[PDB]
Structure 1
């Protein structure tokens, strides 16, 4: 949360209109992460209730 709070501080300062920020846990050393991350980055933009 100390890293999480920082990006919130950084966003609430430098954010303009139309601006959307996304923070995620990520490990570039893991091939699984890379595949799973972009599989997340590339799918839908949809929220099913």
Structure 2
């Protein structure tokens, strides 16, 4: 369950290719845009996970 600064087309394509290139067994790549310099986003991220 990886986070990123912003979710746009380029990162979407990069992460899609990353999963489809490296995935195995029952792998699942969750992904959400969050700010690591914001305590509110950290709290939202932990309560979302």
Range into which the TM-score falls when normalised by the shorter chain: 0.7 to 0.9
Relative contact order: is structure 1 or structure 2 higher (C-alpha 8 Å, sep ≥ 6)? 2
- Calculate the TM-score normalised by the size of structure 1: 0.78
What is the RMSD of the two structures over their aligned residues, measured on CA atoms?
Answer: 0.6
Runs of 4+ in structure 1 displaced over 3 angstroms?
none
**Could you list the runs of 5+ residues in structure 2 that have no partner in the other structure?**
1-8
**Larger gyration radius, structure 1 or structure 2:** 1
- Calculate the TM-score normalised by the size of structure 2: 0.78
- Relative to its length, the structure with more strand (as a share) is 2
Task: Give the number of aligned pairs.
Answer: 41
**Could you list the runs of 5+ residues in structure 1 that have no partner in the other structure?**
42-49
